[PDB]
DNA sequence: TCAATCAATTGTTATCTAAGGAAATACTTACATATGGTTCGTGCAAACAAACGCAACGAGG
């Protein structure tokens, strides 16, 4: 659980910079300030959980590479 | 016939220099209320951070 707590850190922590601290403060309904401080905080913590619950989802790069082959092949 | 001088009792102070050895542990007021401090998440502005565009400069041709 320790590997997929990271991991899913990492994910999260992407899913945030793509789509912007600024972005993602006005969509969510916070501050910047909080968003940044958050990922320093508690996104790990609530990582942890996620890999307890077993919420981990697909890495976007192998995303990318099913989407490819499914494009090739089809 | 009082007091200056001996005499026994009481209290204070002293007993070498270095190196090793680690310290311990009984002896339980409780329930309620006011207040206030501390922790925590937030917002706002300030302070950094990235990546360009433009212009000036200074070397190259």
């Known amino acids: 659980k320790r590997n997929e707590a ?4 990492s ?14 403060a006005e969509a969510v309904g916070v501050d910047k300030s909080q968003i940044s401080r958050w990922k320093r905080d508690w996104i790990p913590k609530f990582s942890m959980l996620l890999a307890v619950l077993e919420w981990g ?14 494009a090739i092949l089809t």
């Open 11 to 24: 994910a999260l922590l992407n899913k945030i910079a793509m789509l912007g601290t600024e972005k993602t």
């Open 57 to 70: 989802v697909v890495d976007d790069d192998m995303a990318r590479l099913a989407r490819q082959v499914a």
């Open 6 to 9: 990271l991991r899913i850190e």
